[PDB]
Amino acid sequence: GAMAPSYRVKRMDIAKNDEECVVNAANPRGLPGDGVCKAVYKKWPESFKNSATPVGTAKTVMCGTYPVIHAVGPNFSNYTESEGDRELAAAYREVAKEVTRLGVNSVAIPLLSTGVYSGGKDRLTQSLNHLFTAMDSTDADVVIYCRDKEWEKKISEAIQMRT
Numbered sequence: 001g002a003m004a005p006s007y008r009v010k011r012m013d014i015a016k017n018d019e020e021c022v023v024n025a026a027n028p029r030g031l032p033g034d035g036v037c038k039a040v041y042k043k044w045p046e047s048f049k050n051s052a053t054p055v056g057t058a059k060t061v062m063c064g065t066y067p068v069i070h071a072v073g074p075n076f077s078n079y080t081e082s083e084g085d086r087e088l089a090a091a092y093r094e095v096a097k098e099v100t101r102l103g104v105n106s107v108a109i110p111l112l113s114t115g116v117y118s119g120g121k122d123r124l125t126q127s128l129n130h131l132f133t134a135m136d137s138t139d140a141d142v143v144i145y146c147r148d149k150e151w152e153k154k155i156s157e158a159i160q161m162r163t
């Protein structure tokens, strides 16, 4: 575990993370995809060997010894708000199980279902709260990666408010 488990947020490409493992915002088919998924495919393409997994689950594949946790959030274009909310919460619970199983002291994590899978809605709070629900009982240092400067502000505020 980390000596004083923390949450942090950085505004940069998760493919340049400084953590012991990465969570991919994966598609269910293990395809190179778009956005975070494409960046992860370019950095760790070996991790896409048999990475296909259903919505609401996480599947870890090693790139060398570096674990890539493929977490499949729901596409809110296809799911109802209710069912999508359930699957988004479930994907993060599976990430917490994997992070725990791997014994890492740190994990880089994007906000699931906030990009192309958001169904064109702002899901920062919904996705971040499900991340906290899952990860709060883990003792890994969690570093959240985002690209938008105002998202960085809002995530940093949400972290600092519970401190």
Ligand SMILES: [Cl-]
Pocket (backbone or CB within 6 Å): 011, 012, 013, 016
């Ligand atoms: Cl960057």
Ligand SMILES: [Cl-]
Pocket (backbone or CB within 6 Å): 025, 112, 113, 114, 115, 116, 117, 118
């Ligand atoms: Cl997404």
Ligand SMILES: [Cl-]
Pocket (backbone or CB within 6 Å): 146, 147, 148, 151
């Ligand atoms: Cl963002």
